[PDB]
Amino acid sequence: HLTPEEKSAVTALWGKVNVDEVGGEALGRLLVVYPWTQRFFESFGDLSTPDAVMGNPKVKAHGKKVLGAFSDGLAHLDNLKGTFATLSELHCDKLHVDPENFRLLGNVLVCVLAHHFGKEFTPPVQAAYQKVVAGVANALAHKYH
Amino acid sequence: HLTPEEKSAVTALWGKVNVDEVGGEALGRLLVVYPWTQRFFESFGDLSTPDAVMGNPKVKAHGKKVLGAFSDGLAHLDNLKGTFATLSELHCDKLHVDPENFRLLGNVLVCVLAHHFGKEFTPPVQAAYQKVVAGVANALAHKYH
Amino acid sequence: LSPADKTNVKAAWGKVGAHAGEYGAEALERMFLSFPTTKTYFPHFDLSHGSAQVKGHGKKVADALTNAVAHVDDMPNALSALSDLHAHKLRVDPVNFKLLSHCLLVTLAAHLPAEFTPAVHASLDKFLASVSTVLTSKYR
Amino acid sequence: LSPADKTNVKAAWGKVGAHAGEYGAEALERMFLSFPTTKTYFPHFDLSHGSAQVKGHGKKVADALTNAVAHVDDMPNALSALSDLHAHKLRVDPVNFKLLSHCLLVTLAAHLPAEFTPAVHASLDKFLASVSTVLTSKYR
Ligand code: HEM
Ligand code: HEM
Ligand code: HNI
Ligand code: HNI
């Protein structure tokens, strides 16, 4: 659970986020850093070289959809299990994505936020966003329980 | 959970499980196989070598307590939250035990069952005990999740 | 790894013998029943208890494992061919290697009780984890 | 670790330079704030912001990593003295290594944007995983 200051600092930073690129960078970095995750995106095409993964227009378009789902999680922090109920069913029952990969993507997003905000992504701001991405990972893995 | 035939197989197999040396062996092996788990048992004296762990009375007495808790969880499989409602808020914000070790302890108990029952601990029987140990581990990882 | 850990593996896999393919096959069999998701890595397979294929790759895993025991130090070098297939082609999730290693430990505990001591267990688990790490260290 | 990976780690650590102690201290702080579970290994430390002991420990963790980037091939020898402190007596859960690694990446991402490219990020994450493994190789 986020303190009032943590909730304020998170919504504050998020409003400054480029909803068009961050999701793409986060998803792209996941496929380069942990390349076994490329097994769920073979239908996306070019993913061999690192510049191809980032420059891929589908990795960029899909990342935007992933970012949207995190924005939804942020808007409703008290109802994460509910917000990610259809997506938990989708990822767990249809896709068979191991829940460990939700934790990795949340951590890659944290690395992307630090990369875009520099010194504005302070250690308590990161501490707050760690609660968020952990909350989203657990809620997206609820159908496995 | 699982099918009542698997619930019958789990209860029949647990009927043959003593109360015991199984728990002592499970807790003991978790301490041997994953030596980082030894940090939470600093008051237990000597553990330096595998024989010191297995030959520890504090270890075997604690192992009994652990298996005794699994037994109660097996008594109420329909609601794992209400049974481990006194054990989850004991291990997390006080002991500071990573929820990953709960999965390892269950998986080590499964090895101890195979070590005791051999051919009797057949693969579909293992599958039922696996859903069980996953449930217990999930229920014990309730708070800060 | 540890020198004391690379003595227990010899004793355990030395008493395994020629029916290593059964010990390997059983571990596979145990994985699909206990973990559903692991089925996806075999789409053209109909493997129930007694299916002809399950012993084939069960042997392949066991023989790849005997190669790893004889080559404990040059393990990333000796099992270099499999590291490519498990990466570049299949792209197996590192978690699923932990699921098989566990079912493999269960099999050894089941068939070899006087061998599966807490010290041998701790070493076999250290071996299999260091094997998994070799088969996964290729995707980039 | 491909020959291109070690070029990326050294180039990124080349822009780290004198700021290594500073980046190591921040990574540790990020770990203490984001994961209070890791504080349990330091009840004898002043875990306040700007502590000279977190700054000093930051320098020790950073120099150990500067030593690891300098000694590219076959690391278990240089970090053997460190493997007995962490694993043999203080016995730190390996997940905490994944946590410090991530906190180290968050630090480098915030301070070196132009050098924290996907390729470097993967090379550093793999390097920190290999340092983590070398620091978790001997367990009793
Ligand atoms: C907490 C992290 C995650 C969030 C918020 C998330 C969110 C989403 C969303 C919103 C979609 C679109 C669903 C649709 O079009 O109907 C999606 C699709 C998908 N996700 Fe995730 N996802 C996450 C993690 C992952 C991970 C780790 C993987 C595996 C590498 C993954 C694999 C997929 C795949 C393969 C699809 C394709 C479904 C489609 O056609 O859109 N996701 N995800
Ligand atoms: C103990 C660790 C493991 C070892 C030593 C191992 C060993 C092997 C060997 C020797 C082969 C034969 C290669 C060939 O086709 O000529 C093989 C094939 C294979 N392994 Fe592994 N393996 C291990 C773990 C896994 C895991 C965890 C999975 C996935 C759940 C997996 C999936 C496969 C698949 C899919 C094939 C090829 C069969 C096909 O083409 O559908 N392996 N493995
Ligand atoms: C590696 C750490 C660790 C794990 C994985 C673990 C996992 C488990 C699991 C299954 C996953 C179960 C069912 C279980 C059950 C119990 N544990 Ni655990 N315990 C662990 C560390 C402890 C410690 C430490 C205590 C005693 C606390 C203390 O400080 O005296 C403990 C005490 C108990 C007690 C005694 C409760 C009481 O004080 O009356 C039970 C019962 N448990 N523990
Ligand atoms: C969460 C626990 C933890 C982690 C993940 C961790 C991860 C790491 C990593 C991983 C990349 C590196 C390179 C590293 C390097 C070092 N650690 Ni770690 N250490 C940890 C807890 C410590 C503690 C505790 C000490 C000793 C503190 C002290 O008082 O000297 C330590 C001490 C050190 C020292 C100094 C020892 C000395 O005085 O000679 C170095 C160097 N380290 N540690």
**Three-class SS of C39-106:** HHHCCCCCCCCCCCCCCHHHHHHHHHHHHHHHCCCCHHHHCHHHHHHHHHHCCCCHHHHHHHHHHHHH
Q: Are B112 and B29 in contact (CB under 8 A)?
A: yes
Alpha-carbon span A37 to A26, nearest angstrom: 13
Chain C interface with B: residues with Cβ < 8 Å: 26, 29-30, 33-35, 49, 102-103, 105-107, 109-111, 113, 116-119, 121-122, 125
Q: Are C23 and C107 in contact (CB under 8 A)?
A: yes
User: How many CB atoms lie under 10 A from the CB of residue A3?
Assistant: 11
**Fold of the C1-140 domain:** Globin-like (1.10.490)
Max CA separation in chain A (angstroms): 44
Domain ranges of chain D: 1-140
Q: Chains A, C: CB contacts under 8 A, how many? A: 28
Q: How far is the CA of C85 from the centre of ligand 2 (A)?
A: 8
Mind telling me how many Å the CA of C131 is from chain B's nearest CA? 16
- Is the dihedral angle over the CA atoms B73, B74, B76, B79 positive or is it negative? positive
Q: Which CATH class is domain B1-145?
A: mainly alpha
Instruction: Tell me, in Å, the resolution of the deposited structure.
Output: 2.4
Atom of ligand 1 nearest to the CA of A84: 5
Alpha-carbon span C120 to D42, nearest angstrom: 33
Alpha-carbon span D109 to A115, nearest angstrom: 5
Q: Residue D118, CB half-sphere, CA atoms under 13 Å: how many?
A: 21
Helix (H, G, I), strand (E, B) or coil at A89: helix
Cα angle B87-B71-C115, degrees, rounded to a multiple of 5 = 105
DSSP H helices in A76-122: 80-83, 85-89, 100-117
Q: How far is the CA of C69 from the centre of ligand 2 (A)?
A: 17
- Which amino acid is present at B93? D
Looking at residue A90, what DSSP letter applies? I
Domain ranges of chain B: 1-145
Query: What φ, ψ does residue D79 adopt, rounded to 5°?
Result: -105, 20
Alpha-carbon span C28 to C30, nearest angstrom: 5
Atom of ligand 4 nearest to the CA of D96: 5
Alpha-carbon span D51 to C52, nearest angstrom: 65
Nearest by Cα to D104 from B36, A100, A110, A16:
A110
Structure tokens at D28: 């540790």
Q: Does C77 touch chain D (CB under 8 A)?
A: no
Deposited experimental method: X-ray
User: How many CB atoms lie under 10 A from the CB of residue B111?
Assistant: 25
